[PDB]
Amino acid sequence: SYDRAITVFSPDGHLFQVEYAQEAVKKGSTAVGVRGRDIVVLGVEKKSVAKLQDERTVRKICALDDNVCMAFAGLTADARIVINRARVECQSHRLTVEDPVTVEYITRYIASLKQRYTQSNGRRPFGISALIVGFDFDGTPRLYQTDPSGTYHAWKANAIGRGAKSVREFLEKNYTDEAIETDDLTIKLVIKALLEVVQSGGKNIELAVMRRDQSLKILNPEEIEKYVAEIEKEKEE
């Protein structure tokens, strides 16, 4: 078995493999999350378009369990490993606790998996960040983010992947009690956030919603372009 130390410190306290894993995430498609009042929304960029692609097979938004889902940015193969590990863990939790996981529980699990792959022989870090959303037993909506280091935090709204800096800036100015007063506006807030950075808007925003108790609904291109027009004609006024 291969036991080389891969992630090591360098002078000044850097972990270069982890910094390089974060560079991988920054070249991934943009992903955005907003925590509503009684909805949570995830939207993600692109990636390629390509008419001959079967769309179903490349989604970047994934159910972990009935009450938790995630989006990611970065290395898609790495993400598939993390997602399947988290799906197994959600079933262990149900098995031994007889409740669904809290969003914080499964986040904490994913983050500590990532942290372990920065401190174990023979392995490189995972080149992904994740946005994790859903609802707790008591109806409280949640949005968490994890990164390759294993650090995690809760957010009101957030973006990861390429153009996350400017999308985050947009959200900081646009996330208010008014912008999330209803479900339709929460959804629009995510689309506006994407439509800033999204190349040939749009077209190639994939979007999904989760309502309290109601399980993951992904929107279709017809339901998306309804919202797109409904915001674009409003921005003329």
């Binding site: 130390a5 410190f9 850097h14 500590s112 650090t151 996330y175």
Partner: protein, 233 residues
């Protein structure tokens, strides 16, 4: 490139020295030991107003009589904290008594140099932990504050700062500390010092504070209790 267990010509392990430099990239934390209890105070370091401040947890309960403040690479601290928790519960299970603060700190510190790539299990630790820790609590010795760093060296301190501004903060701590200082004075002093060293304007959401006292279990200050103490400061 050299191995992770290589000594430098000065007799230090490169990896450990480099891990110590990572502590300086952390937020500042402060610990003070008084005869009336210990307090732990930490700068949260909020990077966006969209981030939930209560999701930053740099002070944690180890057991009812022991808290822990951390600085450095926070993700690294999780396995150390969990080891501390498990050890105090094992000690309770076995001996039906609370574990001393010193003993908890010692147990955690024995993990420190357990890294390397050709003694150990298929995927054991590849590097040291980029974390420093302050353990504050009360046992039959009375109130106690211990510091630990990535070398596995641990020591009792009357007052100690760790992280980015610890020089600075340590100097102000020498100035204000005295053995007969009250807990309420210690709490005020540590917020005054955090206020100086923090880049952001101190307020009741971008710091955390906790105490442990002979009367009373580990206690995290609420927003409302922080606001009260912040008025004077």
């Amino acid at each position: 490139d050299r191995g992770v267990n290589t000594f430098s010509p000065e007799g230090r392990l490169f990896q450990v020295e480099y891990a110590i430099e990572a502590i300086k990239l952390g937020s500042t934390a402060i610990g003070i030991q008084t005869s009336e209890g210990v307090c732990l105070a930490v700068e949260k370091r909020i990077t966006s107003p969209l981030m939930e401040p209560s999701s930053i947890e740099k002070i944690v309960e180890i057991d009812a009589h022991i808290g822990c403040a951390m600085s450095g690479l926070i993700a690294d601290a999780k396995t150390l904290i969990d080891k501390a928790r498990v050890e105090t519960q094992n000690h309770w299970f076995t001996y039906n008594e609370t574990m001393t603060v010193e003993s908890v700190t010692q147990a955690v510190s024995n993990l420190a140099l357990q890294f390397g790539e050709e003694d150990a299990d298929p995927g054991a630790m590849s590097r040291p932990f980029g974390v420093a820790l302050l353990f504050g609590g009360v046992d039959e010795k009375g109130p106690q504050l211990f510091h630990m760093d990535p070398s596995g060296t641990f020591v009792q301190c009357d007052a100690r700062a760790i992280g980015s501004a610890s020089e600075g903060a340590q100097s102000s701590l020498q100035e204000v500390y005295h053995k007969s200082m009250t807990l309420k004075e210690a709490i005020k002093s540590s917020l005054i010092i955090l206020k100086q060293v923090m880049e952001e304007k101190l307020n009741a959401t971008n710091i955390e504070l906790a105490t442990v006292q002979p009367g009373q279990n580990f206690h995290m200050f609420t927003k409302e209790e922080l606001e009260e103490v912040i008025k004077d400061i």
